[PDB]
A paper describes a structure:
According to the tRNA punctuation model, the tRNAs are processed first, and recent work indicates that the primary processing is performed co-transcriptionally through tRNA 5′-processing by mitochondrial RNase P (mt-RNase P). The third subunit, MRPP3 (also known as PRORP: proteinaceous RNase P), contains the sequence features of a zinc-binding domain and an N-terminal, putative RNA-binding pentatricopeptide repeat (PPR) domain, where the PPR repeats are helix-turn-helix motifs of ∼35 amino acids and are found in a large number of RNA binding eukaryotic proteins. Furthermore, the MRPP3 subunit harbors a C-terminal domain that carries the sequence features of a metallonuclease; MRPP3 has therefore been assumed to be the endonucleolytic subunit of mt-RNase P.
Activity assays showed that MRPP3 lacking part of the N-terminal flexible region (Δ102-MRPP3; residues 103–583) was fully active, while removal of the N-terminal flexible region and of PPR motif 1–2 (Δ206-MRPP3; residues 207–583) gives raise to inactive enzyme. Only this inactive construct produced crystals that diffracted to high resolution, which therefore allowed crystal-structure determination. Δ206-MRPP3 is an L-shaped molecule composed of an N-terminal PPR domain, a central domain and a metallonuclease domain. The PPR domain is connected to the metallonuclease domain through the central domain (residues 334–356 and 545–583), which comprises a four-stranded, anti-parallel β-sheet (β1 and β8–10) and harbors the conserved zinc-binding site. When comparing the structure of this region in Δ206-MRPP3 and the homologous PRORP1, it becomes clear that the Δ206-MRPP3 active site is distinctly different from that of PRORP1.
Residue numbers in the entry: 207 to 377, 386 to 416, 422 to 450, 458 to 475, 478 to 501, 510 to 530, 535 to 582
Amino acid sequence: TLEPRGYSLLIRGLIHSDRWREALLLLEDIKKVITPSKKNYNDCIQGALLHQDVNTAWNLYQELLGHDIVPMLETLKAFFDFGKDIKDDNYSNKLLDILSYLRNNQLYPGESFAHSIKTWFESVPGKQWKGQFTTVRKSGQCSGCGKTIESIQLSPEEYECLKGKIMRDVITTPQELKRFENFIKSRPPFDVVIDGLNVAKMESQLLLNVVSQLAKRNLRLLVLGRKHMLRDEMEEVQKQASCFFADDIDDPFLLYATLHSGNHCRFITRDLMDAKTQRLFFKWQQGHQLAIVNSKLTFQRILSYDTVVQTTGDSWHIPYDEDLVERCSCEVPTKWLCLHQK
Ligand SMILES: [Zn+2]
């Protein structure tokens, strides 16, 4: 089932004119048959902002979020662009809410969006915000203002908060889950938990390469596999590491094993996926996932600080993506917008 024919382009062609309200009527027609696209919402929001109807713009944005649509970054950028000319506490709080959206969903502005945010803070009368484009030192100190970036390390309470929350949503076969439970609880904490299956994707001898090289680093390795790997050098893997072979049916064993082992334990697998718990999960993932980067194997660096939109009230630090640099799934941005009040 599709939008009425040509409606997205009709909407896009109306929003700069005095007839822009007609686009919102077309959007209503779309809603009645399908969930509108993020581009549909982008267009109607920009139409509203172009004509200073901030309530309509924000209401459309909230509707979009209600459908669990991920807004285009261009839509978020539009709110800051129009905000430089808007002097109102209520509008400001909405913008700060968009920054919380980026923080909570582990998202980053593109370069021009970062410039729009900078421009908006610097436009707020009386507040004396100054923005600078920076990097972060190895130490975790912003190269602009010298403040220490939020630690990537979860506190014990945070960790047990996350762990407890994860343990209770988990609760495939229960008979097989009990077996794995008894396996883990009768063993010491591991240092790296390896999804042998999902790393055998880039069968046997590269699993061996990951294992045999990690074992030279004096690490306690757990390898998670399925039964079908037992049907040569798998036996070479079984001897170099502790192994659990599940049924060939996706397993929740990697999360359990890693979290049970403790806050020090890291893991290897495919890239992974309330607000506070979600924040902790992103932070934990960033600091604990070991990403393989491609013939002698090397891992992606894990920093001591959390690369995420963040604030201290009197400052913001906002990682952003550069136009000239394409970033992979598992790597964090290296460039930051540093905002501080004088
Ligand atoms: Zn700074």
